[PDB]
Design a protein around this ligand. Structure first.
Ligand SMILES: CCN(Cc1cccnc1)C(=O)CN(c1ccc(OC)nc1)S(=O)(=O)c1ccccc1C
Ligand SMILES: CCCCCCCC/C=C/CCCCCCCC(=O)O
Ligand SMILES: CCCCCCCC/C=C\CCCCCCCC(=O)O
Ligand SMILES: CCCCCCCC/C=C\CCCCCCCC(=O)O
Ligand SMILES: CCCCCCCC/C=C\CCCCCCCC(=O)O
Ligand SMILES: CCCCCCCC/C=C\CCCCCCCC(=O)O
Length: 499
């Protein structure tokens, strides 16, 4: 008898079986998965990155609503009734909307941290303190900007002589204007503005990481060289009509203010009055400013130990140069990436480079000679230092260079995998939150569904959009499992230790 009056009162929806099944599944997967995300980062020091601290924040927001909001949303969508009283009518929508804000601002800070790391020339000194500060800000801002949402939620009773009633929890507005302006702002803040800004940031990240950085490691590879470096250097100098000696190469456009050939040509003039010059060989490859081409050709004419190549060389020829010269001179004024240094170093050539940009990122004190950009006397001094180094075995130096370039290349690949995972996370968020965000706008800004001819269908769309929001929480740990080997390994460790 006790279930009877309630079943007479609560009219079943034909699809409640699948709604309940889908909520139970999402509940279990989101709870276990997001807890294991937190456990993986907290227990394993190699997982401590700013990115993963933000991911932990995302997983905490998702645990919060999985436990406090999802069960209530299921009951409401099944019964169209609010059972939980007035205070929880404010608290539960408040937690839900706070968590949406936390999620999207956390995704935003993830995108900014990757943009500063990859696209901005500088680097933050703080990492974990900066992440902590950002997370605190995210929660403070989120809790404050959703105060209005908590203010407008109210319980209302409706009496269909009355013998019955029902109570719903809903936004209470005085007038038609306020909900329109409020839900415009709500849409911009939770969905439209951060998504547009993150799409822009990840497009620039993609363009820098995939199109402006990286080296083809299957090609720039010493496996393709034959004989000893001594044999190849001797062959190289024989083919270029030069005597044996310490061999320097430059390759790049000829200009004033970018690639530095002007600095190198001045450095050669400085060196040319010194007796050490006679031990040095220069190979200068490039094309561009005709006054600089003429300066270079004038030097080639003056000096038997200077050769200038303005013709186009195949990449295989260049690889042979990198694998036989002693040093590569990279006297850039400006060099965001420094592909020349990575290619040369992969092949054992030791770089002498300006301390700018990506050259400064790549080259350490055991893997090259850094010089102040723009300074021919400094470059001349570095070339003299390289001559003196070359009077002894350079093997360990060449090995250090190869290893550093491989390690830098590995880091680029790792950043690509992480960025790809983060873009998939963003795409899945955009998808999971599109229906509820657009339904909310159509209903509250444009007044759709006011007097609808098919309330059943509209109600079904809203119920699905709510489920899809919680399903996002279940999806994120699954994404980390497929696109991060580090998360995949710690998840497997968890499932294997408990079974
Ligand atoms: C104004 C908030 N909003 C729009 C919205 C856009 C984008 C992302 N989340 C919510 C809503 O649709 C409304 N909200 C809502 C409903 C169900 C649900 O399930 C994921 N999520 C949110 S609500 O006002 O906080 C509310 C109302 C009545 C009962 C429970 C809840 C949570
Ligand atoms: C994805 C892994 C799935 C694990 C298997 C467990 C599946 C259990 C799901 C819950 C079934 C819920 C169906 C109950 C609906 C009954 C409808 C009703 O009578 O009101
Ligand atoms: C085994 C788990 C299944 C996954 C659950 C997916 C959750 C689906 C949520 C409800 C969508 C409602 C679809 C109802 C169709 C229209 C009903 C109607 O028009 O009256
Ligand atoms: C007995 C299983 C039921 C418990 C569900 C556990 C919650 C799921 C949490 C994260 C799922 C990640 C696992 C996906 C594995 C496939 C990926 C792969 O093969 O590399
Ligand atoms: C819960 C997840 C809800 C829907 C996710 C469907 C969108 C998945 C896009 C896949 C894109 C990709 O993995 O490359
Ligand atoms: C609740 C279950 C949710 C489904 C998650 C599906 C999204 C996983 C996409 C993986 C993308 C990929 O590995 O290439």
């Amino acid at each position: 008898f006790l279930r009877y009056l309630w079943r007479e009162y609560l009219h079943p929806k034909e699809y409640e079986w699948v709604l309940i099944a889908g909520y139970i599944i999402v509940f279990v997967v989101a709870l276990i998965g997001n807890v294991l995300v937190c456990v993986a980062v907290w227990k394993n020091h190699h997982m401590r990155t700013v990115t993963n601290y933000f991911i932990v924040n995302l997983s905490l927001a998702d645990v919060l609503v999985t436990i406090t909001c999802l069960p209530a949303t299921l009951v409401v969508d099944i019964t169209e009734t609010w059972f939980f009283g007035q205070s929880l009518c404010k608290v539960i929508p408040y937690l839900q909307t706070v968590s949406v804000s936390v999620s999207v601002l956390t995704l935003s800070c993830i995108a900014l941290d990757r943009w500063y790391a990859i696209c901005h020339p500088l680097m933050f000194k703080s990492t974990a303190k900066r992440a902590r500060n950002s997370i605190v800000i995210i929660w403070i801002v989120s809790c404050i900007i959703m105060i209005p949402q908590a203010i407008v939620m109210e319980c209302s009773t409706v009496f269909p002589n009355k013998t019955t009633l029902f109570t719903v929890c809903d936004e209470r507005w005085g007038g038609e204007i306020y909900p329109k302006m409020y839900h415009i702002c709500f849409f911009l803040v939770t969905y439209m503005a951060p998504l547009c800004l993150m799409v822009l940031a990840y497009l620039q990240i993609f363009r820098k990481l995939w199109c402006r950085q990286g080296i083809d490691c299957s090609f720039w590879n010493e496996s393709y060289l034959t004989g000893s470096r001594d044999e190849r250097k001797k062959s190289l100098l024989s083919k270029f009509g030069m005597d044996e000696g310490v061999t320097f190469m430059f390759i790049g456009r000829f200009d004033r203010g970018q690639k530095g050939v002007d600095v190198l040509l001045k450095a050669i003039e400085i060196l040319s009055s010194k007796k050490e010059f006679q031990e040095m060989r220069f190979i200068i490859i490039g094309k561009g400013d005709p006054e600089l081409e003429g300066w270079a050709r004038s030097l080639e004419e003056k000096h038997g130990n200077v050769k200038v190549i303005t013709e186009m060389l195949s990449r295989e020829f260049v690889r042979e140069l990198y694998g036989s010269v002693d040093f590569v001179i990279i006297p850039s004024y400006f060099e965001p990436f420094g592909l020349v240094a990575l290619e040369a170093m992969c092949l054992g050539a030791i770089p002498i480079a300006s301390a700018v940009g990506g050259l400064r990122d790549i080259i350490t004190n055991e893997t090259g000679i850094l010089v102040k950009a723009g300074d021919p006397g400094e470059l001349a001094n570095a070339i003299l230092k390289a001559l003196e180094l070359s009077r002894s075995d350079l093997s360990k130096f060449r090995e250090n260079c190869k290893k550093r370039a491989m390690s830098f290349s590995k880091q680029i690949r790792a950043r690509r995998k992480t960025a790809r995972m983060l873009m998939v996370v963003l795409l899945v968020f955009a998808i999971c939150y599109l229906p509820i965000s657009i339904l909310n706008v159509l209903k509250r800004v444009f007044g759709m569904f006011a007097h609808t001819e098919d309330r059943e269908t509209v109600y079904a769309w809203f119920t699905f959009s709510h489920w899809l929001v919680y399903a996002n929480s279940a999806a994120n740990p699954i994404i980390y499992n497929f696109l991060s080997g580090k998360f995949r390994e710690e998840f497997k460790a968890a499932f294997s230790c408990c079974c």
